[PDB]
Amino acid sequence: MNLHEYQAKQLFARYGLPAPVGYACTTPREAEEAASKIGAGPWVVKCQVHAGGRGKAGGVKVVNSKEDIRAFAENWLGKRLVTYQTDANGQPVNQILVEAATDIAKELYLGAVVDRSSRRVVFMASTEGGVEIEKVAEETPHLIHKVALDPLTGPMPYQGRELAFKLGLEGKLVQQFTKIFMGLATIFLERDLALIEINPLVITKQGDLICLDGKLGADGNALFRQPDLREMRDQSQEDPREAQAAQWELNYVALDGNIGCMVNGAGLAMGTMDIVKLHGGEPANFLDVGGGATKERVTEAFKIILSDDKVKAVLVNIFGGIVRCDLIADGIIGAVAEVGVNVPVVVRLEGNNAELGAKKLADSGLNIIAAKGLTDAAQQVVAAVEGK
Amino acid sequence: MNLHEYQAKQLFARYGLPAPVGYACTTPREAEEAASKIGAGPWVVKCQVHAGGRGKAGGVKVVNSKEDIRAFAENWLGKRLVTYQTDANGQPVNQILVEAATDIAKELYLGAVVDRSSRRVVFMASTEGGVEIEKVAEETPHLIHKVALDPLTGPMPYQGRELAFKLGLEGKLVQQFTKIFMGLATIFLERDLALIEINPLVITKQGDLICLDGKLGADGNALFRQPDLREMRDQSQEDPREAQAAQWELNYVALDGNIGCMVNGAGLAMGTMDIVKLHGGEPANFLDVGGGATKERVTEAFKIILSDDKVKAVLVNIFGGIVRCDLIADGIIGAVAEVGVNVPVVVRLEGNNAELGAKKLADSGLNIIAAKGLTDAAQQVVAAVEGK
Amino acid sequence: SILIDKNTKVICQGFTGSQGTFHSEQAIAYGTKMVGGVTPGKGGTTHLGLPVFNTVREAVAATGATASVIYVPAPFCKDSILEAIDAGIKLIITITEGIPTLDMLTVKVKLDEAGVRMIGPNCPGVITPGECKIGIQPGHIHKPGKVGIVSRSGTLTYEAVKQTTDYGFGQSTCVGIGGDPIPGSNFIDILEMFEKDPQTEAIVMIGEIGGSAEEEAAAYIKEHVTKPVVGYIAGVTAPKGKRMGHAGAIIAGGKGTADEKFAALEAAGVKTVRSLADIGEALKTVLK
Amino acid sequence: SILIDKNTKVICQGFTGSQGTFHSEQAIAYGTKMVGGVTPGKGGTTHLGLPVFNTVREAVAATGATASVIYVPAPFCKDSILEAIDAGIKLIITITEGIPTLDMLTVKVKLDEAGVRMIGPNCPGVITPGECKIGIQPGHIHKPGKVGIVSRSGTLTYEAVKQTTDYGFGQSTCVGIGGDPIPGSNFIDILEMFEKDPQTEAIVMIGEIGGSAEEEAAAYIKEHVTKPVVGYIAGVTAPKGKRMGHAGAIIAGGKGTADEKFAALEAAGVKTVRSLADIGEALKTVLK
Ligand SMILES: CC(C)(COP(=O)(O)OP(=O)(O)OC[C@H]1O[C@@H](n2cnc3c(N)ncnc32)[C@H](O)[C@@H]1OP(=O)(O)O)[C@@H](O)C(=O)NCCC(=O)NCCS
Ligand SMILES: CC(C)(COP(=O)(O)OP(=O)(O)OC[C@H]1O[C@@H](n2cnc3c(N)ncnc32)[C@H](O)[C@@H]1OP(=O)(O)O)[C@@H](O)C(=O)NCCC(=O)NCCS
């Protein structure tokens, strides 16, 4: 799950990490109130959205006067920000961060993730502050220093020193940094996160280290044991559908094409989409039927996929199943009517009762097509759609 | 601000109060799985919505089998629950609480609030447990007992005994009951609550006291210092037109007539609304214009108002202001256009430059009436709509 | 006059900040004996041609001011009502909106205890026309007169005023008591002050849902108020359990309803006006 | 055969649970040598005709089983897993899905240090068609044969199977490593076995968007496996950094793409199949 900058900062603080003084506002009035809670201008005002590229977007700005603030807020709350990491209609701004401006000597870069390959959490740093590492690494790969937490001992100071030096810090700075790494190294573990990103980690003119920014991700799987986090979720930031899906053990992801897919299993789902584009199709979504393909379940799928008026056809593809092929068929039919699907449907059943099912399908009279084989259905759909 | 049953429970736990073993779920599976992390049931399943009397509504149920549970959840997640306190359009169910069953010996009632009259935080309690206290009080007021927290000392234990004994407890219950009193009394002030209500607070067969239900209300005005609860807010529960509004520093509130009001001021409005009915009309909303009656601000005001298609007119009443007769009419016009409001709109401009503006209005060439007098306006709009 | 007059000296807390400044220019311009403000850390500067202090205390001394106005953010408001009581101000008027009730709940107590007086919070304020003003009240509409106003709500008040002006009467003073559930001085306090004011010949009391002061005001009045009064209440059309802009403007599980109130008033034998409109209308009656 | 054979004696953790039961049933019906199960508290009884124990230690002592399936819920999983290791199971196959990476992460380690094998989690498991079943694997689709398969995804597999089955081939063993980002066993781990399995004539490797895993294997592969392998990767049309259902399916920093993955095998000299339906086919060839 992602968190908000603000929530991140808040935690850092809870932990003792250094961050700007700031206040998350919800109304221009609160926003404009923070300034003098913060003191002497000028101040920083950032939109709290879950995406990056916030800056380039125009949602981050240094300001000189109370009013100037009013304005920004005025200008953004309610609207939807769109960064390069955003969708198309972007995300919604509902809060705004108001913090103290910082005296920037250097920009570093701190971060952590789980290294699949090495099966470790690794923290990594680099001197290249205020730039996306994917880049950095992509090309100055030697500018990144890394360290891996040992599971046996926790994280230790030497490791922090280590990088600190690797970074060429000195004095208290070194002491400081250690502190932080230790700091985050813990939270990481304490709150089951998946990822951290302080970019830029900054060095102030006054010569101190401070997290200018924060970006976290938590492990969805542990929420059940991170109630604080739990509460912090911002559904406002993701595709609602995705949420609906879950509410029905479904795994939805919206795409770009015109062809609806509904499949039984993530593997399949992808493979299925893939095969289709293969046959010139344009998958318009990923759907993974997690529950038992019961009626309501299939029906619910239907709604969902169909939420996107772009889709011109649907491809169902069922293979294993705790449900009898014939059984499902029924519902699908059912489904088709209950909802009212005015779009062709290709169906690829398999497993039990398979023939009976396809038949029922066919005898149905509706615009359903029992597909012969996988690749057949493929064609068929691409087919129907291309018809136009 | 209110809180979800699970939310209070959490709190109560963090304060060490008794409440049952329970888990909050966001999927059947989940829900379905608690049953055993819980142990043998049967167990209770509660929809979680802010409103009350979820029971009648059938949003509550005791249950005997995983399977059953798994169904309830299937049944209600994503749907709206409608209760006597909801809105013809229930609250949306995004979670369900799964909790252990309890052997109810006796049901008391425990609650507390800020008594405006006396100006204290009052806790009252009764044996009329399990019932809508409003009633009990209203019909048998002598079955409520209360104490008032003294703001000089805080909550004292002798107060807690007092009630315990008025409710006629004896033995350990007395001490237990006392406990809680203090418990809650503490949260109250510590969390800046506005209300609490355990209904009921039960005596279990086994002989102890446990908080079977819980309903908290938070002092909106204090959130600023109460980050925890800030996070707990659940907008889903509320009219979205409400927050939108706020973000604009609007005080919006859906009603039911078909005449809309935009008024400058909480006081003014309600009066306004009032006059309207008074002359026949029947308003559909409360509209406190918060910030400067600035174009943008006004526009929204309209947007929001007009979300209700049952509306067949808009009354605008603007007295004071930190703006100007005209600047205002302008903005109205401006609004009218941009929004594209097709219905008739009546306006009373007050004081400052008010004459010019009205002229400006009648000169605009849209369906805008410059009501002369207040009452006049009133009328006008009533007709306007009446017109049919 | 009531609470204030031309003689009254003022100083404002939060003076430097935005609203403080503004609203000040005005009281000032209207001739309110502004005398300085306070903004911690900004002592020893001037602002609006006035001297700033760092402490109610400092300033009170240095100016002999006796009433203060506050434009301090909700979350500091209390260190302010409070500090002022300490510097021994006798009249506090707190504009601020958003103060947590519990803070107010304590302050009320101190205030009582100290015998100090404060009006508010979350209110327009007060003014004694042509005489002096404090608050966001608006000028040129008032006229010195015999009407005394009290309201749990500001905008409305403008209307009354207006009316009483137009019908010629005018007003002694009008008091904004504020929209908070628990306010510095309630109905009665002010009522009392009125009955005893020679300049005031009559009364307009403006209330609204939620609560009971009005109810309480009645009876009081009934048995303690000679002068005639006119009362308009609001929110008749308002719904249960819902806040209507003002914080203390809600209906607590069936209580504090508008009719309920309207009645109560009638019994105390008050001139209930069900139309904000005929406010002046009714006076004329009684006020003859 | 690769991991399990007909001589493999199994037990179930979370046996009496729902999934536990159902699935146990089938294994049972398929001839898998379920020797019993574990459900804390329920020791003493018999479920599915088999005895139920409070501890793995117990169960083990009693049955000498050496394998175990786990139908235990995320939150408690790691505990069981440890438990098992601790009791001396050498092979674990956890099915559960919803496992906190940190947990697994710490768990793999133990596995290694301990020399224990776990398959999973969040995977169908294993079946050695004809002798042994473990997982939601569906019975009747397999044919005892010379094909070996590993897959990160369950359902897909079933496709494969079907083909090899209809193509005459048959399978040696079927291995579903599971789809979490951090598994107990990975491509290599298994491949290595296949390579050395007399019965496995060739292999089908299946994977998707995700890690290196694939990449990593190629490597290995190229320079460590003689038998022939047909490979396929799901996720070509996948979006960047979006968990595609299976937790471990996501494009990290523009890293873990379908294509990459493909490319990468072909290089290792791998028979790459753009289309899923072609596995039977492709094989034919490499298989002739
Ligand atoms: C208090 C309130 C008025 C703030 O208004 P604001 O001028 O926008 O706030 P600002 O930050 O500009 O100014 C507040 C000032 O208080 C000062 N201040 C803070 N703590 C203070 C204290 N204890 N003592 C004195 N001044 C203090 C701040 O320094 C600031 O001035 P500065 O810029 O010189 O620092 C706000 O809570 C409010 O508007 N409430 C309701 C308004 C309303 O609707 N009124 C009418 C209905 S009653
Ligand atoms: C593991 C999982 C299947 C459990 O589902 P379930 O069978 O419905 O669960 P239940 O509560 O029904 O039963 C599980 C049992 O675990 C038992 N249990 C709990 N902790 C245990 C432990 N440490 N050791 C042994 N058993 C344990 C419980 O007591 C329960 O049995 P019971 O009800 O006697 O007492 C669930 O988390 C899941 O499905 N995960 C992923 C599901 C999926 O999609 N799989 C496909 C991908 S491979």
> Does D73 lie in the same domain as D88?
yes
Q: Radius of gyration (Cα) for chain D, nearest Å? A: 18
Q: How many CB atoms lie within 10 A of CB D244?
A: 26
Decide if D73 contacts B33 (C-beta within 8 A): yes
DSSP code at position C239: P
> Does D112 lie in the same domain as D22?
yes
Is C246 a catalytic site residue? yes
Decide if C15 contacts C38 (C-beta within 8 A): yes
- Paired sense of beta strands C144-151 and C125-128, if any: unpaired
Cα-Cα-Cα-Cα dihedral sign, residues C153, C156, C158, C163: negative
> Does C116 lie in the same domain as C57?
yes
Q: Report helix, strand or coil for B285.
A: strand
Place of tokens 């408001």: C77
CATH number at residue D236: 3.40.50.261
What's the gap in Å between A255 CA and the centre of ligand 1? 49
- Paired sense of beta strands B193-204 and B120-126, if any: unpaired
CATH code linked to domain A240-388? 3.40.50.261
Q: Report helix, strand or coil for C266.
A: helix
> Does C66 lie in the same domain as C27?
yes
Instruction: Give the distance from residue A27's alpha carbon to the nearest chain B alpha carbon, in angstroms.
Output: 5
> Does C177 lie in the same domain as C94?
no
Does residue B38 belong to the interface with chain D, where contact is any CB pair within 8 Å? Answer: no
d(CA C109, CA C104): 9
**The pair of three-digit structure tokens given for residue B158, joined into one six-digit string:** 């002798």
Q: What are phi and psi of A272, to 5 degrees?
A: -65, -50
What's the Cα-to-Cα distance from B71 to each of A292, B18, B27, D212, D224, rounded to whole Å?
Answer: 13, 28, 11, 41, 52
Which region holds residue D2: left if phi is over 0, alpha if psi is between -120 and 50, else beta?
alpha
Nearest 5°: CA angle at C18, between C13 and C22? Answer: 85
> Does C212 lie in the same domain as C264?
yes
**Quick one: three-class SS letters along chain A?**
CECCHHHHHHHHHHHCCCCCCEEEECCHHHHHHHHHHHCCCCEEEEECCCCCCHHHHCCEEEECCHHHHHHHHHHHCCCEECCCCCCCCCEECCCEEEEECCCEEEEEEEEEEEECCCCEEEEEEECCCCCCHHHHHHHCHHHCEEEECCCCCCCCHHHHHHHHHHHCCCCHHHHHHHHHHHHHHHHHHHCCEEEEEEEEEEEECCCCEEECCCCEEECHHHHHHCHHHHHCCCHHHCCHHHHHHHCCCEEEEECCCCEEEEECCHHHHHHHHHHHHHCCCCECEEEEECCCCCHHHHHHHHHHHHHCCCCCEEEEECCCCCCCHHHHHHHHHHHHHHHHCCCCEEEECCCCCHHHHHHHHHHCCCCEEECCCHHHHHHHHHHHHHHC
Which region holds residue B353: left if phi is over 0, alpha if psi is between -120 and 50, else beta?
left
Which of B194, B238, B188 is closest to B219 using CA atoms? B194
Pocket probe mutation, ligand 1, options C58, C80, C85, C95, max atoms within 8 Å of Cβ: C95
d(CA B196, CA B185): 10
Q: Which helix (H) or strand (E) holds D151?
A: strand D144-151
**The pair of three-digit structure tokens given for residue A88, joined into one six-digit string:** 């198309």
Q: Radius of gyration (Cα) for chain C, nearest Å? A: 18
Instruction: Give the distance from residue D279's alpha carbon to the nearest chain B alpha carbon, in angstroms.
Output: 35
Which of B151, B117, B320 is closest to C187 using CA atoms? B117
Q: Which domain holds residue C64?
A: 1-122
Decide if C180 contacts C101 (C-beta within 8 A): yes
Q: Where would I find the beta strands (DSSP E) of B4-82?
A: 22-25, 43-47, 60-63, 80-81
What's the gap in Å between C179 CA and the centre of ligand 1? 18
Q: Which residues of A touch D154 (CB under 8 A)?
A: 265, 267, 320
Q: Which helix (H) or strand (E) holds B120?
A: strand B120-126
Place of tokens 């037990």: D11
Decide if B323 contacts B293 (C-beta within 8 A): yes
Domain count of chain D? 2
Beta bridge partners of C273: C232
**The pair of three-digit structure tokens given for residue D34, joined into one six-digit string:** 């379920």
Place of tokens 């009249």: C91
Q: Do A274 and D75 touch (CB under 8 A)?
A: no
What's the gap in Å between C31 CA and the centre of ligand 2? 79
- The catalytic residues of A are 109, 197
Q: What are phi and psi of A111, to 5 degrees?
A: -170, 160
Which of C246, C203, C208 is closest to C226 using CA atoms? C203
DSSP code at position B36: H
Pocket probe mutation, ligand 2, options D39, D68, D82, D126, max atoms within 8 Å of Cβ: D39
d(CA C257, CA A16): 50
Does residue B265 belong to the interface with chain C, where contact is any CB pair within 8 Å? Answer: yes
For an interface test with B, give the residue of A95, A231, A234, A296 to mutate (most B CBs within 10 A).
A231
Does residue B225 belong to the interface with chain C, where contact is any CB pair within 8 Å? Answer: yes
DSSP code at position B259: B
Q: Report helix, strand or coil for B209.
A: strand
- Cis omega before residue D144 (within 30°)? no
d(CA C192, CA C3): 12
> Does D116 lie in the same domain as D209?
no
Instruction: Give the distance from residue D188's alpha carbon to the nearest chain A alpha carbon, in angstroms.
Output: 13
Q: Edge-to-edge, what's the strand order for the sheet holding B43-47? A: B22-25, B96-100, B43-47, B60-63
Q: Do B268 and C74 touch (CB under 8 A)?
A: no
Beta bridge partners of A197: A111
Q: Edge-to-edge, what's the strand order for the sheet holding A368-370? A: A250-254, A285-289, A259-263, A313-317, A345-348, A368-370
Q: How many CB atoms lie within 10 A of CB B322?
A: 12
Q: Which residues of B touch D75 (CB under 8 A)?
A: 37
d(CA C118, CA B243): 32
Q: What are phi and psi of A200, to 5 degrees?
A: -100, 150
Decide if A100 contacts A39 (C-beta within 8 A): yes
Q: Report helix, strand or coil for C11.
A: strand
CATH class of B21-104: alpha beta
CATH code linked to domain B1-20+105-239? 3.30.470.20
Domain boundaries, chain B: 1-20+105-239, 21-104, 240-388
Q: Which helix (H) or strand (E) holds C111?
A: helix C101-114
Residues in A 243-262 with any Cβ partner in D closer than 8 A: 251, 253, 255
d(CA C137, CA C77): 21
Q: Which of C73, C103, C122 is the last residue of a domain?
A: C122
Nearest 5°: CA angle at C205, between C204 and C210? Answer: 160
> Does C61 lie in the same domain as C141?
no
> Does C177 lie in the same domain as C67?
no
Classify residue C197 as exposed, middle or buried by CB count within 10 Å of its CB (0-12, 13-18, 19+): middle
Beta bridge partners of B260: B314
> Does D106 lie in the same domain as D144?
no
The rounded Cα A150 to chain-centroid distance in angstroms is 27
Buried b (16+ CB within 10 A) or exposed e, C13-41: bbbbbbebbebbebbbebebbbbbbbbbe
The residues near B385 (Cβ < 8 Å, ≥ 6 apart) are B258, B259, B281, B312, B313, B344
Nearest 5°: CA angle at B126, between B122 and B132? Answer: 90
Which residue among B121, B152, B224 places its CB closest to the CB of C74? B224
Place of tokens 């146990």: D24
DSSP code at position D167: T
Provide the number of CB pairs (under 8 Å) joining chain B to chain C. 142
d(CA A378, CA A245): 24
Q: Report helix, strand or coil for B79.
A: coil
Buried b (16+ CB within 10 A) or exposed e, C244-281: bbbbbbbbbeebbbbebbbebbeebebbbbbbbbbbbe
> Does D231 lie in the same domain as D102?
no
Which of A93, A52, A86, A90 is closest to A72 using CA atoms? A93
Q: How many CB atoms lie within 10 A of CB B187?
A: 19
Which of B307, B306, B289 is closest to B350 using CA atoms? B289
CATH number at residue C40: 3.40.50.720
Pocket probe mutation, ligand 1, options C38, C46, C97, C134, max atoms within 8 Å of Cβ: C97
Q: Which residues of D touch A374 (CB under 8 A)?
A: 159, 276-277
Q: Which helix (H) or strand (E) holds B315?
A: strand B314-318
Classify residue C181 as exposed, middle or buried by CB count within 10 Å of its CB (0-12, 13-18, 19+): buried
Decide if C63 contacts C36 (C-beta within 8 A): yes
Which residue among A116, A151, A255 places its CB closest to the CB of D109? A151
Q: Edge-to-edge, what's the strand order for the sheet holding A96-100? A: A22-25, A96-100, A43-47, A60-63
A and B make contact (3+ CB pairs below 8 Å): yes
Q: Which of D84, D107, D122 is the last residue of a domain?
A: D122
Q: Which of C122, C137, C161 is the last residue of a domain?
A: C122
Decide if A170 contacts A105 (C-beta within 8 A): no
Q: Which chains touch A (3 or more CB pairs under 8 A)?
A: B, C, D
